[model samples]
Target chain A: DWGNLLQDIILQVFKYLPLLDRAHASQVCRNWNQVFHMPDLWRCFEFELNQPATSYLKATHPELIKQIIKRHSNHLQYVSFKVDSSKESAEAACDILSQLVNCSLKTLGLISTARPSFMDLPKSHFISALTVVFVNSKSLSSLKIDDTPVDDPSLKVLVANNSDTLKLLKMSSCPHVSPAGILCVADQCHGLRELALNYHLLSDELLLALSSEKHVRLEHLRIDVVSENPGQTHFHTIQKSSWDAFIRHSPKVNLVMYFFLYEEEFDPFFRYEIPATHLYFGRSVSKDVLGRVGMTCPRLVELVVCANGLRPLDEELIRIAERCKNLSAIGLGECEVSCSAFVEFVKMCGGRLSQLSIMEEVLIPDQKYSLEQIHWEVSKHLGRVWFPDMMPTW
Target chain B: SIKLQSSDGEIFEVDVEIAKQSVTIKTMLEDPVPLPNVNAAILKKVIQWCTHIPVWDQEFLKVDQGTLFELILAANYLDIKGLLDVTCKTVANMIKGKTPEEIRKTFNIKNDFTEEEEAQVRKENQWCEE
Candidate 1:
């Protein structure tokens, strides 16, 4: 007993503290604080541009802001900026933002969550005509942009103009991505592999207009559609559903949205609960949607299609399994899938699959389906040639 | 059984289970070989730690590692689960809100970061207090 407590003290019992708590450790005894502020402590920086960060910039002293930018810029690998201001605010905020951009940033986020404060006011801040120059940091890869009502002309200029070293782009909650922006993205940043959007006002027409003509290749696509806005129940909602021609042109690549983790709850695409929280991250295959994905992208491999807790492959995956003879593995677990379907998925991945992790254990924690007795399936599909246990499972 | 020589040149023979606590030793002893780098002092400490704890879970070590994290690695290598757990838990706890200076002092680590680098880190993690 004495040894336990002493060991605890010697071990220094505070490794898993939250971010802020770790910083606070620096305020404890000098020894404790030193470890807390070690360079390694602040390696993986996750910055969200809107809400808290914006409020912080507004509240923090200018000197403090510079200090913050300098500290995080070096080690930051993932950065997200949510813009919730007017054209003037975006201009004024450029001082601090430019400093952040100037740093060796890996991921840059441009989130726009603006409300019409009486309209007919300034609107240049909507990223209609913006130019971003990325520098340093080879690992810098992903970029995200939220939507605001920027002028179509200005957006066209930017879309037809601005395109840099952005590998992944996520344009959700936007009402206006002008044809130009779409064109610009296609023309310049053709390295795009993953894209997501909240289609409250976008139509498949816009996508069809963009993808059918452009020669760019898109690998991963997620279009969530909400027929209504947050508080505009009685108003004429924008075009929330889509039927894009570009989607039919899903790119062919060795894609893996596996490393990206998201706690997806409810349907942000449709702006409400879409049956279950579509947990589409990680390696899990749904029993449904497999055919839909196969139909969608013949060269697609990994996918998630959760519809009523029962989906196979989303046409894309099946197409990849059938077409991409080099198809390594796939997953649709945790979203909406059945065990029997999972069994079929395993059989489909007969000879050439290296790593395939599908969620098993028949019933979930609080599932509604009448789970007759505790029927859990402990899935094990270690391909015959997994390095005898060598491939690093991320 | 395997023999280890610590940095201070002290030699000691330990049972395979105890020696295997340190992955380094485990890998070395796979074919009945001796362990290098672990001189008498370090080897003695490693053996003591392994003997004191139960078998450890390897799943935990696969997260991420570096030079500084090696302290925890060494602790884990010796099957010193308590030490490893506490060290890991301490690293996690450092995530709490605090300033760079305060953190450096607490961990008993020096501030090798330059002024510009320090500023950038502080800038990115603006919510150091939260």
Candidate 2:
């Protein structure tokens, strides 16, 4: 009777099963075996490549990967390759990618689960394997190839093939790509909605190009401002007018910025009006820089300061709550904020402050509020019981 | 109210809103709404399903395997997506974490493949087991 079940019905059931269970179910009967090779089942797949010795993950068997490439390559549409930290695993992933010449994927993401193993591959080999997909899959919509050796020429090839269909592209820490390469993409890819890149590749020209009428309204833009050299401080600034133009074109764009620079390296940033909705400081940010942020980033929705100094950021917190009316989420670590000012900060932001994760040590008891009573006052304003995050005891 | 006639000459009155959940029923609104493929037992169960939604569903679907299969066929013929999904998912849950032998036993399926054919299929699927 199970064998007599309609193929479509069995297919629906198979859709919910995991890969191993589905394979197990396939050997139940001859009809079930036929459903195992159904083209629909092969459309969205993630090839998990890992070395048993280096990774705890159970790798997709090599024989099975070969079978997929040989039989169901053309059926793939939304595909991803999740490789472990090992270079051998990354190479194995690339080897699989190169063989995907016959496939036409729409959303392809090459994810390195740990320290970017993709970067360890020779640039030519990586590009060659990636190009097979770019050239073959003419309708790539979303691509996330971060921390790889993808160059400008390969990016040009991507724009050439997937210009109309490409919507989201995230290729941060790609050292070979310059501002001109991104400019090329902004110029050609009219449907680009989301982009993530290094701060160095973010030029005024690129912003202006994205602001042009030919380009679609970008939804999200993430910039990783990393310190390439220890003492490197000089960084270019995007003019306020360029940012103004970009905001005018795409007002609702979520401009997320991650700052991982030295103290002096923060000179060029937060100095002018930047429409950043999300700001994350991975390094110790100065009071002056934080003060500048309050003055400049009016569209800031969330702020996460990972580490700060001994100085209490009372004025900066108040200034942010006052200026950035849309501020809903904030996290503080290794920072100082008086309990009184913290309560006042919550009172000003009101019930809309959905996520207020502050470290217990960050708040200093003042005359108006003590550490014991601050949570109640903050809770009264926030309409919920609130407590500062505690450091976990290992 | 709409009248739905099952194959066994049983007539049931259902709300128009509830009946419209089935695209098949919605398009054929101007009828006794005869469902030739569904019998009275399955039709009654399907009507019960369209009327009551979940935690209720867990209780409602506590029927025998024959009745469950009939409900699936009825759900598919009537084109009720919610009913079809829940029923299929229930069956899939039954199939989950089950070995080929266990699955065949659970579903009352005979190993129809020849000895050599069964061995080949098992070898092909051996990679996943490890």
For lDDT, the strongest prediction is 2
Kindly report which residue stretches of model 1 are placed more than 4 angstroms away from their true locations once superposed.
A1-17, A29-64, A74-77, A82-95, A112-121, A125-140, A149-164, A173-176, A197-217, A224-394, B1-3, B7-9, B12-86, B89-127
Q: Model 2's DockQ?
A: 0.71
In model 2, where do residues sit more than 4 Å from their true spots?
Answer: B14-18, B25-33, B40-53
- Prediction 2 global C-alpha lDDT: 0.87
TM-score of each: 0.45, 0.94
Docking class of 1: incorrect
Question: Would candidate 2 be rated incorrect, acceptable, medium or high by CAPRI criteria?
Answer: medium
Worst 10 residues of 1 chain A by lDDT: A269-278
> What is the C-alpha lDDT profile of model 2 across A244-347, one tens digit per residue?
99999999999999999877688888778889999999987998999999999899999999988979999999999999999999999998999988888888
